[PDB]
Amino acid sequence: VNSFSGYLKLTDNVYIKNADIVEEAKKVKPTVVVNAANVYLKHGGGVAGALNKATNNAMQVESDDYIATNGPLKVGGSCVLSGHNLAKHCLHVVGPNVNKGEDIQLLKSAYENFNQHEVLLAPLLSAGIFGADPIHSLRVCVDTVRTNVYLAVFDKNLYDKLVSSFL
Ligand SMILES: O=C(O)c1ccc(O)c(F)c1
C-alpha cells in the first residue's frame, strides 16, 4: 500500500490522475519525483520551471553545480539529485524535444530510467512543451516501465483524452 490517492489504474503498474505535479509532490512527498529535464538541467519552463520554482530555485542551484562537475546529460539519460521540499529524490530525465528535432525513438530509452526506481511520481515524458504526442508518450510508458508509476497530467482536457483513447 502507498500514499497516492485518486488515480485511475491503467495497467498492473501504471496509474494516472489529472493533477498539478507541483501540488501532488507537496502532498505525497514521494521517494522519487521525475523532472522533465533538458541536457543542461536549465529548469526555465513547463514541469522543470514549475518544480524548480516550488523549490525557491534550490533545484537550479544544485543542478548548476552538477553540470559544472559532470557536463550535460544525454538525450534519453537521467541523473538523481535532491527532491528538496518536494520528494526525497528528483530523477531528472531527458526525453527527446521534438521542437529541437531529437529522435522520438529516444523516448523509450528515457522511460527505461524509471525501471531503476520501485515507485515514482512522474509527468508524461516529451509531452507539453517538449512537442511529442502525449498519447504516444503514454503508450511508450506502459510498454517500457515495469516499476510502479503514478502519472500526473496537468491539462484536464488532455487527461480525459488519454483515458478515453487508452488501449
Ligand atoms: O505537465 C506539465 O506539462 C506541467 C505541469 C505544471 C506546469 O506549471 C507546467 F508548466 C507544465
Kindly give the distance from the C-alpha atom of residue 141 to the centroid of ligand 1, in angstroms, as a whole number: 18
Residue 40 DSSP symbol: T
> For residue 120, how far is its CA from the centre of ligand 1 (angstroms)?
17
**What residue numbers bound the domain in which 84 lies?**
1-167
- Tell me, in angstroms, the distance from the centre of ligand 1 to residue 69's CA: 28
Atom of ligand 1 nearest to the CA of 152: 1
Q: Which residues contact 50 (CB under 8 A, 6 or more apart)?
A: 20, 21, 22
Number of separate helices (H) and strands (E) present in the chain: 6, 7
Total structural domains within the chain: 1
Grid cell 522543470 in the structure block, residue: 48
DSSP string, 67-135: HHHH-PPPTT-EEEEE-TTT-SEEEEE----GGGT--TTHHHHHHHGGGGSSEEEEPPTT-GGG-S-HH
**CA 121, 89, 155 angle in degrees (round to 5)?**
30
Nearest CA to ligand 1 atom 5: 47
